[PDB]
From a paper:
Oxygen activation in all heme enzymes requires the formation of high oxidation states of iron, usually referred to as ferryl heme. Ferryl heme refers broadly to a highly oxidized form of the heme in which the iron is in an oxidation state that is either one equivalent (FeIV, known as Compound II) or two equivalents (formally FeV, known as Compound I) above the resting oxidation state (FeIII). The results indicate that the ferryl species is finely tuned across Compound I and Compound II species in closely related peroxidase enzymes.
We thus developed an anaerobic procedure for direct formation of Compound II in CcP (see Experimental). Single crystal spectrophotometry at 100 K on crystals of CcP that had been reduced with dithionite under anaerobic conditions, followed by anaerobic reaction with H2O2 (see Experimental), showed absorption peaks for Compound II (λ max=530, 560 nm) that reproduce those in solution above. The Fe−O bond length extracted from this XFEL structure of CcP Compound II is 1.76 Å (with an error estimate from SHELX of 0.013 Å). Nonetheless, in this structure the Nϵ atom of His52 shows no density for a hydrogen atom and the imidazole is therefore more likely to be neutral (not protonated). The density for the guanidinium group of Arg48 is flat with all the hydrogens in‐plane, which is as expected when Arg48 is positively charged (Arg48 is also observed as charged in the neutron structure of Compound I). There are several key points to note when comparing with Compound I. First, the hydrogen bond patterns to the ferryl are the same in CcP Compound I and II (i.e. hydrogen bonds to the Nϵ atoms on Arg48 and the Nϵ proton of Trp 51) and do not allow space for a OH species bonded to the ferryl. These hydrogen bonds to Arg48 and Trp51 appear to be “locked in”, as the same hydrogen bonding pattern is observed in the X‐ray structure of CcP Compound I and in the neutron structure, Figure 5 B. Since the neutron structure of Compound I in CcP conclusively identifies a FeIV=O species (from the absence of nuclear density for a OH species), then we therefore interpret this ferryl species in Compound II of CcP as also being unprotonated (i.e. a FeIV=O species). That said, the bond length of 1.76 Å in this CcP Compound II structure is measurably and (within error) longer than that for CcP Compound I (1.63 Å). By comparison no such flexibility in hydrogen bonding to the distal Arg is observed in CcP, as the active site hydrogen bond structure is “locked” in a fixed arrangement that does not change between Compounds I and II.
Residue numbers in the entry: 3 to 294
Amino acid sequence: PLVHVASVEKGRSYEDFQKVYNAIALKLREDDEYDNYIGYGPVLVRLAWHTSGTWDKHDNTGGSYGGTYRFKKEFNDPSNAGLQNGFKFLEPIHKEFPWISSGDLFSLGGVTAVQEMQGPKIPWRCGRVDTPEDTTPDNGRLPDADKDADYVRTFFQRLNMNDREVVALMGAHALGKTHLKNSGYEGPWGAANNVFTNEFYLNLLNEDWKLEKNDANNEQWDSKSGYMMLPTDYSLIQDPKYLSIVKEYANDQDKFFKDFSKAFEKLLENGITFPKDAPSPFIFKTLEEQGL
Ligand code: HEC
């Protein structure tokens, strides 16, 4: 197993990363029209997860550390279709702050998006270091959506996530939507899809779902409110262990926030060794908290 030791960008401290956070946050506010006024929040959360979610605990390949999505093999992974929009949004940020590593920027984009969308605070640590093109993981390590709960459970063991962490992370599917041209699935999961809430679990339990085929000839679950669930989303209410946890998060907003925060930080930190004297995780203030 490879070791990736966090190395703080030289001379940087919390203030420097709060400025990067702020630039991302201000651009999220400015470029509000994207994706029919959903805004870039959801795609940036997805970019942070896909750049992290290639990790393999068994050999420490993939993961957020190396920033490898900047290389064409990963950029062009069919599982990443659509994420180029988030990369494009981050380009002017990286140009302004060229000292931040790519993995630090992709992960911080996700943290900033969750918090600016009124999600929980996500502690975040710096020090990912860009690694060379030959460290890019091959395609095929991100999950399929047409699968059942057994597939989801097994898939996430590779990311060292347990049932609770899986169910909490999937609550990010409140955000954004599926786009047929990107993934073969179409529609949002709920109404509040650029504000981070526990709506995903409420809709799983509360909506009347019908198994339909979309225009790409794939099955998805649809509600008459115009929401959808992927087969892997719906698996969370088919499996009795996941269903218990879905009910818990549908009934406790604060517990979902706390558990999501922990699991998302862990996702973004998998694979990284933080030296004992590394800085503590940073908790960035939102623009609203700063009066900006
Ligand atoms: C914590 C983050 C998170 C996790 C974990 C996650 N997703 Fe997503 N996913 C998102 C976000 C956010 C979006 C919305 C992106 C957008 O609106 O551009 C999304 C969108 C998608 C889409 C639609 C992409 C498109 O633009 O068409 C698919 C398909 C998808 N997820 C599949 C899955 C599957 C399969 C899993 C696991 C079994 C999963 N996701 C786990 C955050 C996540």
